[PDB]
Amino acid sequence: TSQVRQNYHQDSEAAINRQINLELYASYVYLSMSYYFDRDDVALKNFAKYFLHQSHEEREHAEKLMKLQNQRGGRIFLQDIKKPDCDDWESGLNAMECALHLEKNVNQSLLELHKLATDKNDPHLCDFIETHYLNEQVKAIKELGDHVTNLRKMGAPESGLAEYLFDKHTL
Amino acid sequence: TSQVRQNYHQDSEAAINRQINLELYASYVYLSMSYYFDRDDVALKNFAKYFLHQSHEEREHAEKLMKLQNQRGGRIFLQDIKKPDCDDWESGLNAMECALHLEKNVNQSLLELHKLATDKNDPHLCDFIETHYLNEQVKAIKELGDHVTNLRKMGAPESGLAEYLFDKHTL
Amino acid sequence: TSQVRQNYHQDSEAAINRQINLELYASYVYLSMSYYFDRDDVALKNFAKYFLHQSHEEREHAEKLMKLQNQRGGRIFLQDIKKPDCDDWESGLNAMECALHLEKNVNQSLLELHKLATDKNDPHLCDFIETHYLNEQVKAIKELGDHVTNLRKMGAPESGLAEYLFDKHTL
Amino acid sequence: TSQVRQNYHQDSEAAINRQINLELYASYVYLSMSYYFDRDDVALKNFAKYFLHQSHEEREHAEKLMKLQNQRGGRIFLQDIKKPDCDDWESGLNAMECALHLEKNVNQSLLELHKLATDKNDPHLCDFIETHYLNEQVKAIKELGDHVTNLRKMGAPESGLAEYLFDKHTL
Amino acid sequence: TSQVRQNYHQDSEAAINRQINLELYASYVYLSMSYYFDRDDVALKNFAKYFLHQSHEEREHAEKLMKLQNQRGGRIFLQDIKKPDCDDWESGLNAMECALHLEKNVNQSLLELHKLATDKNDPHLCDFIETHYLNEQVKAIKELGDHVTNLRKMGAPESGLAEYLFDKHTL
Amino acid sequence: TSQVRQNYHQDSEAAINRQINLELYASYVYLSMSYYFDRDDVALKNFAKYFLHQSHEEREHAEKLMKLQNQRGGRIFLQDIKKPDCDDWESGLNAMECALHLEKNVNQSLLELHKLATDKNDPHLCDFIETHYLNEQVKAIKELGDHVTNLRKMGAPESGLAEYLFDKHTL
Ligand SMILES: [Fe+2]
Ligand SMILES: [Fe+2]
Ligand SMILES: [Fe+2]
């Protein structure tokens, strides 16, 4: 080769292609959780609005990594998007716990991308990872921890009143 | 079973689940075409804006079919989303022709869904298909036909001036 | 030295220096309690806002006593600020009870400062203590008593729902 | 362990606890200098306003480091705040020189915190130190150097007219 | 040495002095290209406006590096500014290609400055280079690549209609 | 060659090319003086603002002479820009005196350009020199004379108070 390429290694180009796929998979999981809480025998409408908002945000993360791949002069390659593991998520607390567990895996993958960019001496890429991706993750993990703690103390999951009232007063 | 179900057959419930998957696949194809025209050795920015807009619309079609599945009392089941057939779309006219060919398949599948809903005597579902899906498709097919006709008459694809000027004046 | 000094005894000058230190110590205790309720396994955000507000107010009390020491012609002398007794405050009701117990000690010290100013025949100082410090304390003690009474009646501390709901509706 | 902790070493957790104490000590020194210039036999009111502003800012630095310690999942531990070395600061130029000498020690401690965070491979923490603490220090050191240079050239400290006029025209 | 110097090595001071000269040279080249397109037998007025804009921006970059050298406590030393290599730039496409080739050299020099600042353990300087210089360069290189690609496809340089229409519709 | 040339002699075309170089050299001298007064052991901020303004004006003078060379049908030829004679200007009065001495040389060169244009019978060029360049110079020389006179009477350069107060009240 590209007429704009300068100081961009092949291994970095492949690791960006793996991160794009992982962000699209996260968007698909949040879409599944949103439409579980809209069923007539669950019926919790602010849980549903919250998960549809997280799904719209993961898609923007993936689109911004594609724009970076074109700005540096590499080529995009897409794979299949696997379906999520559960079809039914059982309650509000169990879904908040699965969301926490998924955000920690995404953070672990971003840390190794930063390490590899540091070994090839590529400062523009390190700064991109720090400026746009790496403080957003810690804020998301902190907020999910708070939600799980409150729901356990109110008395869930053996208490329907607890989840009704958390739905009204926090979300 | 559900406490709201009334006059909703098992075969209709399975065909809605297939239509959801097909709309998500169309959204992923348009996303691929958008970021091909943003490369530095193609560089046609209004083609790119047009395909990103079509991609945002297919996702809204799929979400509305999910809301219908929950209103009638059926259960949603998701599958894998396959990747698109091309990685490189070769030109501005070839991408418009592939888009036309994709929209005619989606229209053909909606016609058989309508026929099956007519054979089980389900009027609410027939009216839903007519009111939200069936005139949008014919409008989209007409607009793509116009674009292909103009691009062939201007002199594409063996003429770069032709696609530059169509990009500026029509899109 | 002093060219402004008139009718200001040495013992009053030393007792003002002790009161300055006590107000700074109270500010540091409230700062500790504020950041306990911000931890991820406690997570009660209006308790945290309330204690950070009390901490900002104790610092203004101390600064106003320093301005008085300079207006009368005495000299300020600072000591070390000791650290608070607890690191972990254990619950929402226990922290309100410790706050009540701290405000009664501060009120007891202000009463002896007033008595000593009365024995040296110093009316400007007596009036300063009455106008700015002595009705604020009784208002603070009354409000903390109300909070403790309500929290005990709702069912705390063996009930997480009780503190969740007090956090939302009163604070 | 904490349910949010990921990639946060014990030694970093102890060094953050030392930095919190150092920022609170700096706030206490600036508070002492502010109320020296308010005495009736010094009487320089813009020096006093300037040092009270610096004291309000050091307290915000310390509070932001406490919020970071809770966001990553470590535990805060407080110590005593020592009193400052001087009770009487002697002149307007001598106080600016002591302020410069204190800001260079705070900068030296931030540099070693950055080095230790680099040895444990912790990029979120390095970026926090760079974004919020490390250009503020160089700006503060540059401004104090300018003030000292001007005061020495005007003729201080053996000239009362010099400090009167610097108080009116610069501060 | 200086009373503000802390952790600033001699080799970094010399390398900043070389970068200042390079930015001034780039400003002079863009000024030459601007007034070539204003001649009466070339006469392309939006090419001329575009190159005057780039010339003002390079001068701003050089002035900001001088402010940094004074903030850290080093001393500025200026050299002669050489004249550019061409007097006549021959067409619009050839001038866009020379501009691309110049921006890649400036980017290479910034990368070696970052490497040297990393070897002496100087984090304030690394962060300055990343925050103000490294993403601007990649954006400029991407935009010049797009321009060259479009101009070759329209039919330049053996086509005057092509450059007339690009001047009118893009610049 | 030119199709617009009429009554424009070769010697005038060469003398305009020398004047362009001289105005760019003056712009570079004023840029050096501006960043001397921004050092931390000089620290006089209105002297610095004044010299940066003069530097921005000399560049507009040079650009307007280039536009004239293209309007009459001659060709521009650039040379190297030499560095200024001093690196350190040592005081405020000494820098005002060097600025006065520079403006008288520029005025002397404009007078000989006018004389040569009068010998070849070229009235458009004589009128251009009178309308845009010749009353600006006498205004600049008068203002610098006033500044030098006031600074000598106040007591500079063996008096730092004098330059502090001139910086505040005049500039
Ligand atoms: Fe046209
Ligand atoms: Fe309630
Ligand atoms: Fe004055």
XYZ file of N, CA and C and ligand atoms in Angstrom, chain D residues 165 169, chain F residues 165 169, ligand 3:
13
model
N 3.968 46.621 44.813
C 3.610 46.782 43.411
C 3.427 45.450 42.680
N -0.004 44.475 40.601
C -0.021 44.396 39.140
C 0.008 42.977 38.570
N 7.690 48.043 34.910
C 6.592 48.996 34.834
C 6.265 49.425 33.402
N 2.486 49.120 31.755
C 1.682 50.307 31.467
C 1.641 50.729 29.997
Fe 2.250 51.944 39.176
